[PDB]
Amino acid sequence: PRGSHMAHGVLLEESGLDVQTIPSHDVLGRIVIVPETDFSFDEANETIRTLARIDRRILEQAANHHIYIQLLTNPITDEPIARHLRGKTPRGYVPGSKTWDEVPGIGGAHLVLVRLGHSEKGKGHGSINLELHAFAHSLDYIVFDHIHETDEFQALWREEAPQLFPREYFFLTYPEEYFAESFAYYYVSEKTQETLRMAAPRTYTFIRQLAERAS
């Protein structure tokens, strides 16, 4: 007997997955959607624990805006709402070098898609952490009302991105990518946070106080 509340994925709080020792699991339980088919508990647990490093207030903002992060075992291009992407080149890549079938995450909308097993840099993407980076796009556009376009953030990007991402074209030259990757550096580990602080101290302070910038 399979309920329709699980047919298209399972909200984490309804999944039976044990997350009682994860910080902010009461909020993440209403944001994260896990697969309704077999999946790796280790991969989901690591992803959710990385998301749990985020300031609780920001997670509450995401939940109150009804942003969801759906963890997939399948490619994004098997989801009906992404099926038009099958076999197509993603913008910014040379055709033949990449297809959307190989892109493991998409952020920006109220539904963030993250394929499990692809978190680390180079696994189909160039971010230090796929789930933080993709979620940050949705935070940027929805919670923070395109904060990467503000005068203050634009000035931080101009002054500090050349110091932090001199060799990483997308993060250097796209303000929304600079925002999302700076967010990931702040939250993925103490080491990456201190790297951000040393190379881009005003950006570090901006991310640190991000929760006070919502709309």
Annotated binding residue 110:
no
Give the interface segment with Zn ion, choosing from 17-25, 53-61, 114-122, 170-178 (CB under 5 A).
170-178
Q: How far is the CB of 90 from Zn ion (least distance, A)?
A: 11
The contacts of residue 137 (CB under 8 Å, 6+ apart) are 107, 108, 112, 176, 180
* Shorter beta-carbon distance to Zn ion: residue 178 or 204: 178
- The single residue listed with the structure tokens 């700076």 is 182
- Counting residues that bind Zn ion (by CB under 5 A) gives 2
Take residue 142 and report the two structure tokens written for it. Answer: 């929805």
The contacts of residue 104 (CB under 8 Å, 6+ apart) are 76, 114, 115, 117, 118, 123, 124, 125, 130
Q: How far is the CB of 211 from Zn ion (least distance, A)?
A: 21
Q: Is residue 51 packed enough to be buried (19+ CB in 10 Å), middle (13-18) or exposed (0-12)?
A: buried
* Shorter beta-carbon distance to Zn ion: residue 160 or 177: 177
Annotated binding residue 8:
no
Provide the annotated binding site for Zn(2+).
Answer: 133, 137, 177
Contact footprint for Zn ion (CB under 5 A)? 177, 180
Provide the annotated binding site.
Answer: 133, 137, 177
